[PDB]
């Protein structure tokens, strides 16, 4: 059980106009820059999985043990 | 059910294709003779254009589709003759064969082989035989292929040659209005590589004819009103050489390329000056091209014509720079004295005379500010040398009565009382200049700087005013002395004056207003280069504004000067540079949108406006970004003032409802500025919308906002019966429309409505489609953006010279070498023709006709008669030479 | 101020001056469409991002309940005394009713429609306007499409009617100077 939080704050902005063609050139702004500015930003992969194999199927219980 | 007695064609032309696969098979007789007998019938029926239900295509499509599908691919023995015939007789039916999804099937037959010339039987048909589907294919398939793989196979080279031949065909079939659809393909073919279209069309029109280019030029020039920025620049630059390459008129090149000075490229303006010095060899083609180069586009061009021919071939520069200005002043004096101008009217203020009996008695007004407003009325109405000798002594007694600020304003009124004077205006000012009063001296210096404003000659650049500036002993007697200089060299970007006014802000004087005025002057001196001013300003902002959280005079002088120093550039790199320079707290972030929009003076970008309205959309703005929304609404009128006039009306529709009805602070307060800036003609739509929400001040809202609506009430020049409304509002202005809060506002509005009969026009639109300069100052004047309480005190120093980009009203003048001719023409309403084959009637209502040097008026097109040949520019320039030539016996 | 111009005109923009299958018209109607979509988006955001609301001042509901839920509309005919006017219903049945507070006792005038309760039948409000839907329907609000360009040439008649109905509005300086009333 968690208290949680949530808000709306904003409404959608699907302003479809001649913008639909600008998106073709705008991405080039990244093609000419993101290949030179940085190359070595990354995060580890496959280590998040190594939890599930150690399933502790020999579960231990103390002396006064509830059990279904 | 109509079938029978004639459908033998669905019999024999049905058996022949049925055995045509056999023709491609072991029997070459079907491979040759049957192919010829089908191709000849198809060519004959699609050749004539009398029956628009083709009798051969429409009886074959059902079987012919599969026949063509299974004939060409299943032949495997493609000889030149048989394969050429098959491709020729299977490429034509596709327009009838397939539906809209045919872009992928324009080449399934035609690309297989090129049989001879595809236009040989597609030569004289306008938009019937093949050029329609060919144009569609080249429009869409080529663009899809060249989207990223521009350098490719025949889809670029051979497609280019096909485009050339199809343009030739469009010209040679009928040479009809479909030529105006040839540019379509030109802009649809190589969309991105438009250049290799536009140049091609230039050369194609080079050997076309020297007279059939004007229509193409007009179509392109009015298609350039709105498109992609780079496409805009490319189209403009390709239009530039058109009046030179094919045609040799070369007379409008100097007029239609000044429009590409600021917006296109600085080096474009350099090459325009280069071509203007290379041309103008004919003496006529120099005095006219130099008439507009100074008083219609901008200044700072009095030294570019000083070559080794400075006797008369290069002495014209000094003529058109300042001597033409003096001659124009003398003309605007003589004509005005001839027609309509008494010496000392001073009546409009006294026009409130029928109200003497109304409302009981008088003797109610004793306000000291009233004397100030009265003086400003007497100044503004007395322009165009409406000097009042000893009738301004009332301003001397008021100057000796009260209102030191009003004293300064009254002293500066003499600047615009004697406007654009060089002989003795300074001499008149000098007598009162040595009055041993700080405010009087400051007003005298402001008036002196105003007198030579716009002339930008080398008369007294820094002789008198700067000698006092370098002696800025008093706090008050330091701002205007430099501020007027910024106005005096507004059109001049001379770095000497820029670095000389930089020390004003580098003096570290305690008067923050002095720093603000220096920033304004440096902004209004240069509108292009000199980023060093921007660096110095930003450094001063960082070192000063960080420790203060005061009124927007910072936001009224620093970011405004920054935007003026980099105004009018769609590169947006300078915008990003200044944006990343001043990342700081939100009270400074108010200037982010200001600097963002100041570099977007006018263009078609619905993205820009979309983010402009999304930025200050609602946000509920609990006293957070009210200044941001204020500048957003004050600027929404900008970027939209040249939308081909559709945007103006649509914007008025948006502003009339959206912000007016569901607005809280941006709507109730800063919504009249957009109307006050949208237009300056005077029309019932806005003149009705403004008073309905304005004469009812709605004191519940920030009632002072209604006062702002009063000022933009006078946004229309050219006096008219609009007065009749405000006159009435004057009487309700006694109790309502608070006197101590709106009296001076109403009075200045009523003085601006009927201000100067001559020189009334002030809208920064010289030429039908040009707005080069003059918006600089007009932006600072309207940059009060609320805070009218601050305006009450600042204006006495500012409002006198706040709007000083006024051009003279009249445009109709013979302008002969001796000004011999008077007039013979017919003024009328605006144009009534765009793309008409029949005679073009520009003058909708030719009924109106005058034969004097009289005024032009805003919605007036002028045409001439009596065979004067008007060889200068043929439209209107106020300085056309109009030499006669009548070789018509 | 009267009801004011109350103008009646859709008249968005007519510039289709190419009048053919040219590009100018396509770009122009593109501008029109995108402005209209922009305004629609603004009004959606205006109506979607409203966070502020109380709007009852702890008494508006009190006044709302004090007056009956199905208020009826009647015709005042006299006001003999303060707090004891006399009204009538549709059937011509008069009633010596009372007048309550929270009703601006300034704008009421014999012959004006008023709002009444059921159970006690007192005056609780004033109905601002009453125009039957046979006169508001006669009005026009979408202008018809034609203009002077389509008329086949009637210069005398057009000039005549223009001096009649149009000219006195736009440029009403001459008639006063001459001292004439324009024709009606």
Residue written as token pair 């026949």: B67
- How far apart CA B385 and CA B379 sit, in angstroms, is 10
Partners of residue B639 on adjacent β-strands:
B602
| Interior angle at CA B754, CA B751 and CA B757, nearest 5 | 130
Beta carbons of C31 and B646 less than 8 Å apart: yes
B494 contacts: CB under 8 Å, gap ≥ 6 = B300
Q: Output the CA angle A61-A64-A66, nearest 5 degrees.
A: 70
Among candidates B466, B535, B547, which has minimal Cα distance to B504? B466
Phi, psi of B74 (to 5 degrees): -105, 35
User: What angle, 0 to 180 degrees and rounded to 10, lies between the N-to-C axes of helices C23-48 and B214-223?
Assistant: 10
> In 3D, which of B599, B687, B677 has the Cα closest to residue B636?
B677
Query: d(Cα C141, Cα C6) in Å, to the nearest integer?
Result: 10
Distance CA B720, CA B753 (A): 8
Whole-number Å distance between alpha carbons of B349 and B332: 25
Closest residue by Cα to residue B480 from B454, B506, B443, B453: B443
Cβ–Cβ contacts within 10 Å for residue B53, how many? 6
Give the chain A residue whose CA is nearest to the CA of B615.
A13
Quick check: helix, strand or coil at residue B826? strand
For residue B213, the number of C-alpha atoms closer than 13 Å in the C-beta half-sphere is 23
At B584, phi and psi to the nearest 5? Answer: -165, -165
Positive or negative: CA dihedral B491, B492, B495, B497: negative
Rounded to whole angstroms, the Cα distance separating B833 from B839 reads 9
The rounded distance, in Å, linking the Cα atoms of B182 and B178 is 7
**Residue that is written with structure tokens 């808000």 in the block:** A7
CB-neighbour burial class of residue B103 (10 A; exposed 0-12, middle 13-18, buried 19+) = middle
Residue (of C39, A55, C170) closest to B636 by Cα position: C39
> Which residue does chain A place closest to C45, by CA atoms?
A11
Helix axes A19-31, B606-615, angle to 10 degrees: 90
Which of C80, C107, C77, C99 has its CA nearest to residue C89?
A: C77
Q: What is residue C123's DSSP assignment? A: E
Which one, of B124, B99, B136, B101, lies nearest residue B46 by Cα? B124
Go through chain C and tell me how many residues it has. Answer: 184
Rounded CA gap, B606 and B619, in Å?
21
Cβ–Cβ contact C16 with B under 8 A: no
Helix axes B553-565, B531-545, angle to 10 degrees: 160
The alpha helices in B529-669, defined as continuous H runs, are 531-545, 553-565, 573-581, 586-598, 606-615, 626-636, 646-661
B828: β partners:
B861
Pairing relationship of beta strands C94-95 and C84-88 according to DSSP bridges: antiparallel
Q: Enter the tokens of residue A31.
A: 């093609």
On the CB side of C15, CA atoms within 13 Å amount to 22
DSSP class per residue in C37-72: HHHHHHHHHHHH--------TTTHHHHHHHS-SS-E
Residue with tokens 């009809």: B176
Distance from the Cα of A21 to chain B's closest Cα (Å) equals 10
Please compute, for residue B710, the number of CA atoms within 13 A of its CA located in the half-sphere on the CB side.
Answer: 29
Query: Which value, to the nearest 10 degrees, does the dihedral of the CA atoms of residues B492, B493, B494, B498 take?
Result: 110
Cα–Cα dist B770/C7, whole Å: 33
Q: How far apart are CA B684 and CA C170, in angstroms?
A: 8
3-state secondary structure of A60: coil
Contacts of B646 in chain C (CB under 8 A): 13, 15, 28, 31-32
Nearest Cα neighbor of B301 from B289, B309, B313 is B289
Using an 8 Å Cβ cutoff, are C31 and B646 in contact? yes
Name the closest residue on chain A to residue C44, using Cα atoms: A11
For B651-713, the DSSP string reads: HHHHHHHHHHHS-SSTTTTTTHHHHHHH-SS--HHHHHHHHHHHTS--TTTTTHHHHHHHHHH
Contact B835 C22 (CB under 8 A): yes
Give the nearest partner residue to B223 out of C23, C41, C172, using CB atoms: C23
> Which residue of C lies nearest to B180 if distances are taken between CA atoms?
C22
Give the separation between CA B29 and CA B26, rounded to whole angstroms: 9
* The pair of three-digit structure tokens given for residue B413, joined into one six-digit string: 């009124």
Helices of type H across B207-323: 214-223, 229-239, 242-245, 253-256, 266-278, 284-287, 289-295, 316-318
Given the structure tokens 């493609």, which residue do they identify? B78
Distance separating alpha carbons of residues B519 and B442, to the nearest angstrom: 18
Least Cα distance to B477 among B500, B453, B509 occurs for B509
B414 contacts: CB under 8 Å, gap ≥ 6: B379, B392, B428, B429, B432, B447
Helices B704-713 & B788-798, crossing angle to 10 degrees? Answer: 40
Angle separating helix axes B512-525 and B495-506, nearest 10 degrees: 170
Side-chain half-sphere of B428: how many Cα atoms within 13 Å?
Answer: 22
Place of tokens 């009430």: B713
Place of tokens 């429309």: B737
Asked if B811 and B877 touch (Cβ cutoff 8 Å), the reply is yes
Q: Name the nearest CA neighbour of C163 among C145, C147, C183, C177.
A: C183
Which secondary structure element, helix H or strand E, spans residue C116, and what is its range?
A: strand C113-116
Q: Which residues pair with C113 in a beta bridge?
A: C75
Burial class of residue A58, CB neighbours in 10 A (0-12, 13-18, 19+): exposed
**B875 token code pair:** 């439209």
φ/ψ bin of B620: left (φ > 0), alpha (ψ from -120 to 50), beta (otherwise): left
HSE-up of B35 (CA within 13 Å, CB side)?
24
**Total residues belonging to chain B:** 889
| Tokens found for residue B409 | 């304003």
Three state DSSP letters for B405-464? HHHHHHHHHHHHHCCCCCCCHHHHHHHHHCCCCHHHHHHHHHHHHHHCCCCCCCCCCCCC
Whether B218 and B247 have beta carbons less than 8 Å apart is answered as: no
Max Cα–Cα distance, chain A, nearest Å: 73
Q: For residue B541, what are the contacts with CB-CB under 8 A and spacing of at least 6?
A: B554, B558, B582, B588
With a CB cutoff of 8 Å and minimum separation 6, the contacts of B264 are B233, B236, B237
Chains in contact with chain C (at least 3 beta-carbon pairs closer than 8 A): A, B
How close A31 comes to chain C (CA, Å)?
30
Q: For residue B639, give the nearest of B572, B720, B556 by alpha carbon.
A: B572
Using an 8 Å CB-CB cutoff, list residues of chain B that contact chain C.
177, 180-181, 183-184, 187, 219, 222-223, 226-227, 604, 606, 609-610, 613-614, 617-620, 643-647, 649-651, 653-654, 658, 662, 684, 688, 692, 695-696, 720-721, 834-835
- Kind and range of the H or E run holding B864: strand B861-864
Which residues are within 8 A (CB) of B566 and not within 5 positions of it... i.e. 6 or more apart?
Answer: B531, B534, B574, B578, B595, B598, B599
CB B867, CB B801: distance < 8 Å:
no
Distance, first Cα to last Cα, chain B: 68
Tokens of C178: 């001459």
Residue B309 CB contacts under 8 Å (≥ 6 apart), including other chains: none
Q: Number of C-alpha atoms within 13 angstroms, CB side, residue B48?
A: 10
- Nearest CA to C27 among B235, B638, B647, B140? B647
Burial of C68 (0-12, 13-18, 19+ CB in 10 A): middle
As a whole number of angstroms, the distance between CA B633 and CA B672 comes to 9
Q: Minimal CA–CA distance to C122: which of C138, C141, C142, C102?
A: C102
Give the number of residues written for chain A. Answer: 68
Residue B318: CB partners within 8 Å, gap ≥ 6?
A: B302
Q: What is the DSSP letter of B766?
A: -
Look at residue C119 and give its three-state secondary structure.
coil
- Residue C41 CA to its chain's centroid (Å): 26
Sort out which chain C residues have CB atoms less than 8 A from A14's CB and list them. Answer: 41
Tokens 């004047």 map to which residue?
Answer: B781
Instruction: Output the CA–CA distances (angstroms, integers) from residue A17 to B64, B224, B607, C129, in the order listed.
Output: 42, 19, 8, 44
Q: How crowded is the C-beta side of B584, counted as CA atoms within 13 Å? A: 17
DSSP B472: -
By the 8 A CB rule, do B234 and B198 touch? yes
Resolution in A: 3.8
Torsion angles phi and psi, residue C80, rounded to 5: -65, -45
B666 CB neighbour count, 10 Å cutoff: 24
Hey, CA dihedral for C105, C109, C114, C119, is it positive or negative? positive
Per the CB < 8 A criterion, the answer to whether B101 and B93 are in contact is no
What DSSP line would sit under C66-115, residue for residue?
HS-SS-EEEEEEEEEETTEEEEE-TTS-EE---B-SSS-TTS--TT-EEE
Q: Which residues of C touch B184 (CB under 8 A)?
A: 23
Sheet containing C84-88: which strands, arranged edge to edge? Answer: C94-95, C84-88, C72-81, C113-116, C123-126
Tokens of B817: 């070498």
Measured distance CA(B250)–CA(B242) in Å, rounded: 9
Q: Is B161 helix (H, G, I), strand (E, B) or coil?
A: helix
- Cα(C83)–Cα(C99) distance, rounded to whole angstroms? 4
Number of C-beta neighbours around residue B514 at 10 A: 23
Token representation of residue C117: 């309760």
Number of DSSP helices (H) and strands (E) in chain A, helices first: 2, 0
SS (H, E, C) B790-821: HHHHHHHHHCCCCCCCCCCCCCCCCCCCCCCC
B610/A18 touch (CB, cutoff 8 Å), yes or no: no
Among the partner residues C30, C38, C48, nearest to A15 by beta-carbon distance: C38
The one-character DSSP state at B731 is H
Instruction: Please give the Cα distance from B115 to B81 (Å, whole number).
Output: 9
Distance CA A22, CA B607 (A): 9
Q: Is B867 helix (H, G, I), strand (E, B) or coil?
A: coil
Alpha-carbon distance of B489 to B482, in angstroms, equals 11
Distance CA B867, CA B821 (A): 13
User: Closest Cα partner for B715 from B757, B685, B767, B672?
Assistant: B672
How many C-alpha atoms does B798 have within 13 Å on its Cβ side?
24
Closest listed residue to residue B139, CA positions, set B80, B87, B91, B184: B184
**Which DSSP category does B862 fall into?**
E
Instruction: Name which of B183, B226, B835 is nearest C18 (Cβ-Cβ).
Output: B835
Phi, psi of B88 (to 5 degrees): -65, -40
DSSP run (H or E) holding B861 = strand B861-864
The rounded distance, in Å, linking the Cα atoms of B215 and B178 is 12
Q: For residues B265 and B271, what is the distance between their CA atoms, to the nearest angstrom?
A: 10
Query: How far is C-alpha C10 from the geometric centre of its chain's CA atoms?
Result: 16
**Distance in angstroms (rounded) separating the CA atoms of residues C40 and B861:** 38
């Amino acid at each position: 059980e968690v208290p949680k939080e949530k808000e709306k704050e904003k409404v959608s902005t699907a302003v479809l106009s001649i913008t639909a063609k600008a998106k073709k050139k705008e991405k080039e702004k990244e093609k000419k820059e993101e290949e030179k500015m940085e190359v070595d930003e990354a995060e580890k992969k496959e280590e998040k999985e190594k939890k599930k194999e150690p399933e502790p199927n020999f579960q231990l219980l103390d002396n006064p043990a509830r059990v279904m | 059910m109509e079938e029978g007695g004639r459908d033998k064609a669905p019999v024999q032309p049905q058996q022949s294709p049925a055995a045509a696969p056999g023709g491609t098979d072991e029997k070459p007789s079907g491979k040759e003779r049957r192919d010829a007998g089908d191709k000849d019938k198809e060519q004959e029926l699609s050749e004539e254009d009398k029956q628009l239900q083709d009798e051969l295509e429409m009886l074959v499509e059902r079987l012919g589709e599969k026949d063509t599908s299974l004939y060409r691919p299943a032949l495997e023995e493609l000889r030149r003759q048989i394969r050429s015939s098959t491709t020729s007789m299977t490429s034509v039916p596709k327009p009838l064969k397939f539906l809209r999804p045919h872009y992928g099937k324009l080449k399934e037959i035609y690309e297989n082989m090129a049989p001879g010339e595809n236009k040989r039987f597609a030569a004289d048909i306008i938009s019937v035989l093949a050029m329609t589907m060919s144009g569609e294919r080249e429009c869409l398939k080529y663009r899809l292929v060249g989207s990223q793989e521009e350098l490719a196979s025949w889809g670029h080279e051979y497609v280019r040659h096909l485009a050339g031949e199809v343009a030739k065909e469009w010209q040679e079939l009928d040479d009809a209005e479909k030529v105006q659809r040839e540019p379509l393909l030109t802009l649809v073919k190589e969309i991105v590589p438009y250049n290799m279209a536009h140049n091609a069309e230039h050369e194609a029109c080079d050997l076309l004819m020297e007279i059939e280019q004007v229509d193409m030029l007009e179509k392109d020039i009015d298609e350039n009103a709105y498109a992609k920025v780079c496409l805009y620049l490319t189209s403009c630059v390709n239009y530039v050489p058109e009046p030179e390459n094919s045609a040799l008129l070369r007379c409008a090149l100097g007029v239609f390329r000044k429009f590409s000075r600021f917006p296109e490229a600085l080096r474009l303006a350099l090459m325009l000056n280069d071509m203007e010095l290379v041309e103008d060899i004919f003496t006529s083609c120099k005095d006219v091209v130099v008439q507009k180069q100074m008083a219609f586009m901008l200044g700072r061009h009095g030294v570019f014509l000083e070559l080794s021919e400075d006797v008369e071939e290069y002495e014209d520069l000094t003529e058109i720079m300042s001597n033409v200005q003096l001659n124009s002043n003398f003309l605007a004096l003589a004509r005005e004295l001839d027609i309509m101008e008494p010496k000392v009217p001073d009546d409009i203020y006294k026009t409130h005379l029928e109200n003497n009996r109304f409302g009981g008695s008088g003797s109610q007004v004793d306000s000291a500010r009233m004397n100030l407003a009265s003086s400003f009325v007497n100044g503004f109405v007395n322009a165009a040398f409406g000097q009042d000798k000893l009738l301004t002594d009332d301003g001397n007694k008021w100057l000796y009565k009260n209102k030191d600020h009003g004293m300064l304003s009254a002293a500066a009124s003499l600047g615009m009382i004697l406007l654009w004077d060089v002989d003795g205006g300074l001499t008149q000012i000098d007598k009162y200049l040595y009055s041993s009063e700080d405010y009087i001296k400051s007003g005298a210096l402001l008036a002196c700087g105003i007198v030579n404003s716009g002339v930008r000659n080398e008369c007294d650049p820094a002789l008198a005013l700067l000698s006092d500036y370098v002696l800025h002993n008093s706090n008050t007697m330091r701002l205007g002395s430099i501020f007027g200089l910024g106005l005096a060299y507004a059109g001049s970007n001379r770095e000497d004056v820029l670095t000389l006014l930089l020390p004003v802000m580098g003096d570290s004087k305690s008067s923050m207003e002095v720093a603000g005025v220096t920033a304004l002057a440096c902004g209004m001196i240069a509108v292009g280069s000199c980023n060093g001013d921007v660096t110095s300003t930003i450094l001063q902002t960082i070192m000063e504004k960080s420790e203060t959280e005061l009124k927007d005079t910072y936001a009224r002088w620093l970011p405004l000067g920054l935007g003026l120093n980099h105004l009018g550039k769609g590169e947006a790199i300078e915008a990003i540079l200044a944006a990343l320079e001043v990342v700081s707290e939100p009270f400074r972030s108010f200037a982010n949108t200001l600097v963002d929009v100041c570099a977007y003076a006018g263009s078609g970008n619905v993205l820009k406006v979309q983010q402009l309205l999304h930025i200050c959309s609602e946000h509920f703005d609990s006293k957070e970004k009210e200044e941001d929304k204020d500048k957003k609404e004050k600027k929404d009128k900008d970027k939209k003032e040249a939308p081909a006039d559709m945007g103006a009306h649509q914007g008025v529709a948006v502003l009339g409802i959206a912000l007016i009805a569901m607005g809280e602070e941006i709507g109730a307060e800063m919504a009249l500025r957009t109307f006050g800036h949208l237009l300056r003609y005077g029309e019932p739509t806005l003149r009705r919308a403004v008073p309905l929400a304005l004469a009812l001040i709605s004191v519940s809202n920030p009632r002072l906002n209604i006062l702002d609506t009063l000022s933009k009430f006078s946004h229309d020049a050219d006096p008219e019966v609009s007065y009749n409304s405000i006159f009435a509002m004057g009487m309700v202005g006694s109790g309502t429309n608070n006197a101590r809060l709106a009296a001076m506002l109403r009075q200045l509005a009523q003085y601006h409505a009927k201000d100067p009969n001559n020189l009334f026009m002030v809208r920064l639109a010289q030429g039908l489609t040009h707005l080069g300069k003059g918006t600089l100052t007009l932006c600072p004047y309207h940059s009060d953006r609320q805070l009218m309480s601050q305006v009450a005190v600042a204006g006495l120093l500012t409002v006198l010279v706040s709007f000083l980009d006024v051009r003279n009203i009249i445009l109709g003048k013979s302008h002969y070498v001796l000004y011999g001719l008077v007039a013979a023409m017919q003024p009328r309403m605006l144009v009534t023709f765009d793309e008409e084959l029949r005679p073009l009637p520009v003058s909708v209502r030719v009924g109106q006709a005058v034969d004097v040097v009289g005024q032009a008026g805003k919605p007036k097109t002028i045409t001439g008669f009596q065979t004067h040949t008007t060889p200068v520019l043929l439209a209107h320039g106020e300085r056309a030479e109009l030499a006669t030539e009548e070789f018509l016996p | 101020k009267k009801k004011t111009k109350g103008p009646d005109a859709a008249s968005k923009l007519p510039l289709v001056t190419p009048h053919t299958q040219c590009r100018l018209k396509l770009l122009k109607l593109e501008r029109i469409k995108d402005y209209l979509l922009m305004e629609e988006e603004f009004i959606r955001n205006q109506e979607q991002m409203k966070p502020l609301e109380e709007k009852q001042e702890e008494e508006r509901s009190k006044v709302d309940d004090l007056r009956g839920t199905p208020m009826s509309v009647g015709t005042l005919e006299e006001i003999i005394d303060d707090n004891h006017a006399i009204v009538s219903t549709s059937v011509g049945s008069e009633h010596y009713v009372s007048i309550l507070s929270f009703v601006d006792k300034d704008l009421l005038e014999p012959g004006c429609s008023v709002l009444l309760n059921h159970k006690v039948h007192a005056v609780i409000g004033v109905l601002m306007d009453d125009t039957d839907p046979l006169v508001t329907v006669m009005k026009v609000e979408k202008a018809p499409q034609e203009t002077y360009a389509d008329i086949g040439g009637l210069d005398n008649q057009i000039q005549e009617i223009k001096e009649s109905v149009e000219l006195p509005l736009t440029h009403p300086e001459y008639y006063e100077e001459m001292g004439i009333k324009p024709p009606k």
